[PDB]
Structures are given as structure tokens and as C-alpha cells.
Symmetry: C2
Subunit: 300 residues, 2 copies
Amino acid sequence: GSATLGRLVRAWPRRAAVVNKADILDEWADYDTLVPDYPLEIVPFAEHPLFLAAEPHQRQRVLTGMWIGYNERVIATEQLIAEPAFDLVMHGVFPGSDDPLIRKSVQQAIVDESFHTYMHMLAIDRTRELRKISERPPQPELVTYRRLRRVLADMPEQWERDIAVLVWGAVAETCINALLALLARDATIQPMHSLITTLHLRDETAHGSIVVEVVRELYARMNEQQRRALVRCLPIALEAFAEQDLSALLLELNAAGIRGAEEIVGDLRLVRDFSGARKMVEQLGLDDAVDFDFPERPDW
Amino acid sequence: GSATLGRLVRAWPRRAAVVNKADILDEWADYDTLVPDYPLEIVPFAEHPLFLAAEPHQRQRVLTGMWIGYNERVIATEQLIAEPAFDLVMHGVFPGSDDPLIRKSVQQAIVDESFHTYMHMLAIDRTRELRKISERPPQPELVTYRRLRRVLADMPEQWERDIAVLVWGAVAETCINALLALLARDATIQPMHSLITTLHLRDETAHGSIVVEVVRELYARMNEQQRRALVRCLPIALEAFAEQDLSALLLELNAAGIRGAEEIVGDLLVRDFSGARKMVEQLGLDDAVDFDFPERPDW
């Protein structure tokens, strides 16, 4: 079997966030209210005159809101997109998925996603308590999940729905959110915010390598119509993860009471790193068969 | 907020198997094939004449099968019974489940169950490799799960189905498998077999405490007709976890080639219900539940 997979399975105890920082709760120990929740430098409208025209506490409420929103979207992605793909592999629904090495690598990833959900859930609860955020509008559906559900809606056959779910999860796990990596390195924000994202990023880098190996092995064992289906679905999943939907920004800005929120939003790097998914496409020998313009590899 | 829930949440990093023995895979290192997989002492037909009249390799193959069978059932219980109940709580379908202390304790439990599945899956894989078992017959559907399907068939509405799933999960997590506890303490079997079960039991002791606290809190917030279904639901789940089904024994004796397997099973390990009894008290359902709780086992 895959030496990459063997190596990833062996490294998991030395690498995983759940093993090496299970005590994340205690990181709020000596909290400092004076330190921001989110870095202004990665806010796209940070220097828009209408955002600058606001009062300092209003800008701070937007930053806090964007931090909470980012954590909400991470949890929804894990729960609705990434974990269901991992679960399908473990269920043995694809030929070749009964392999001990595939099963070990993916079950480890499932433990990691559980702990990721734990960390991000903690981040929301602690922030809401400490910032005294009593109430907050029930946020919109993920654009990525909306696309998934619409693809699946009129699909007759379970075998094809399984392919779509796998591909959506695979793309999610190989296309790293710019906010994950930018938040991870940021020294200006709450140290627990930088830390949680640092931990998640370390695990996600391994998850992308696992997904590349696992998808190669399963595609190789798939029949032609399964293979064909995987191929059609890739560009659709890739475009869903490339698509920016700034509905969340509008709600945050309106929440904070910033005047001209519609103007600021309507007025509008932060691209995902698609390196992993490009490697995935390469490993499948699909380097000319996928209709997607891959963005440049980010500096970070 | 519950002081028990609070203590268990803050102790989780020190307690959790996932933190303490993530490298469980490496425990197979200096592997000794001479050490049995499973203790004869706890095999219900160990002293049956037809079992004793089989060859040494045949009896050792049964022990291997029962160990693998144990692990298969643990995984199935976690996947089909325990995790769904915990997920239901996290999906906030019940009033009062949005509480951050409840969410922390249950999410930590969910991390634990994913790691338990991992441990048990690898015990199966490492045993099958080292003992050279190339094929194993399809296993029977869990008795507990078969009974679950039945109740859900009888109670088909979405809101009914949530309550049944929760109770099924709750009973599973508060009634400790005799085999879990007896394997954990066994000094004669493969050290990693007693280790995995020791680790799982340590976690499960906490989970039982968690479930009693959570279910109580969720009980307070249900409407008349939800409470109704939960109270009527408890004894059926409890009966399900108490009913002893012999079908998996008859399969190990065949997988091993033992003659008169039917007679053996014809001629034929009660859970510790202590945690579930407490759950019943905590709900004030002491007089309401028609179920006869067995005496606590010494272990």
C-alpha cells in the first residue's frame, strides 16, 4: 500500500491536535479583553471610508462577528461536508475502501474532525460569553452546501450521490481556506484564536495528503460510470469552493450598525489554496480533463 | 451548571484514551503469539463436553473469533446506537441542548467514541493479520439494534424517532457490558486486548456520568407528549440491553469447525445496570419504570 498513507498513519499520534493540545479549554485562563478577536489586515473593507466612518466599538463588533462567523462556517463544513465523505469511505460503499490502511488513515481523520468541531465550538462559546454577545441572527446556509444539495436533489441513484458526497468532501479537505492559514500566523489577535487555527491547519495539511491517496486508490477500483461521474463532479465542486458569497459580511456589518453596509458590500489574497486539489487531479491523471482554472498558489 | 459535568469536562484531557494512548497501534510491537486473545474463564461453553472434545487449535480459534466478535459488536453499538444519540443532542433538536456545558461534555464524548471505534477496528485488523484469518462470515444484526428498528417502525414520526434514538443511546452508555469489564482486568490475555478495554472502560465510566446529567436536563424541557414517549421508551431499551442472544456464539463454533454447535447453544454475563438505575432516579421515574434491575456485579 501507499507509503504516504503508512507514514501518515504512523505520524498521527505525534501530529494530531487532539493528542497534543486536548487541554485547549484552559487557554482562556488569563483573558485580555483589550486584544482583538480578528485581524483588521485581513478584512476586505478595512479601509473603506464607510467602515472607517464608524465608531471604534462598531468596528470591534464587526471583527468579533467575523471571528464567530468564521468558526460557525468551519463547524458546518466539517459536519455537513467533510465528515460525511469520510463516513462514506468507512462504510465501505466504494470498491477498495475495505483496505486496512485506508480505514486507519480515514478513521484518524474522523477523530481529528470531531476535535476540530470541539475547538471551534469552544471558541464561539468563550467569545460570546466574554464579549457579552447575548443574541446573534441565525446565519445563512453555506454556499458550498447549497451547491451540494442542489446537485444531489434530482440524482436518481445512490451510487452517484455517494460519488458527489465524496468529491465535495475531497475538495473541502484539499482546498485550504485562506482564513485558516492567515488566522494561524496572526500575532495581533487573541492567542487562543491563532492557536486553534494553527492546530487545525497542522491537521488539515495531513488530511489533504490522505485524501489525495485515498481518492486515487478508490478511483482506480471504480467502474467506468463511477469514474465518469467523479470526473464530471470535480469541476462543479471546485467552482462551489471558488465562489465567494458575501452575504455573511452584510449581516455582520448590519449587525454592528455600520451605515452604508449595502454600499460597502456592494462595493466589494483571500483565495483558497487549491494546491492540494490540483495534486489530487494530477494523481488521478485528470490534468487535462477538468474544466477549472486553478488560481495561483498563495504565498502563505 | 452541573458540578459533575463541570468536573468531567475539565478532567477530560487527563482521562481520555485518545490523549493517553493515541499510539495504541504500536502496542503490537514485540508480539507473542503464545498468549491467548480471549479468556476461556469467561466463555459460557468453555466447560461443555462438546467444546472440550474438540482439538487444541479448534478451541483457540473460537477464543480468537469471540475476541473479534466482541470488537465487531462494540463498533456497531457505537456507530448505530451511541453516536446517533450524542449527535442528536449536538444538533440541538431537544430544548435545552444548546447549553455550552452540555455541548462540551457531549462533544468530548463524541471525540471519545470516534477513538474507541479506531481502537477496536485496529484490534480486529491486527488480530486477523497475526492469527491469519482470511475470511469471516457476515455477522448477525445486533440484538439491541434489531429491537431499535422495531420500536422505530412502531413509532414512525420524526419527533418520536428522536426520543427513541436518545433513550437507546442513553441506555447503551449507562449499562456497562460485562465483557468490557472482565476483559479490562484480565492478566492472561494479549496485553493490548486488556489495554484497549481498560482504556474504553475508563472513558465509558465518565460517559455514564455525563449521560445521567444530560438526560435529566433534557427531561425537564420536554413537553407532555415527549416525556410520555421517553418514559414508555425506557423499559423497552432496558429489556433490549438485558436480552441475551446466542446467535453469535453459534457462529463462532461454526467458524471454528466444532461438531454439535447446536447442542452446545441449546444447552446454554449480565451488564452493570447501576448507571441506568441512577438515570431512572434522576428523572424521578423510580416507580414508573417496569423493569427489574439486576444486582450490581462485583466488578
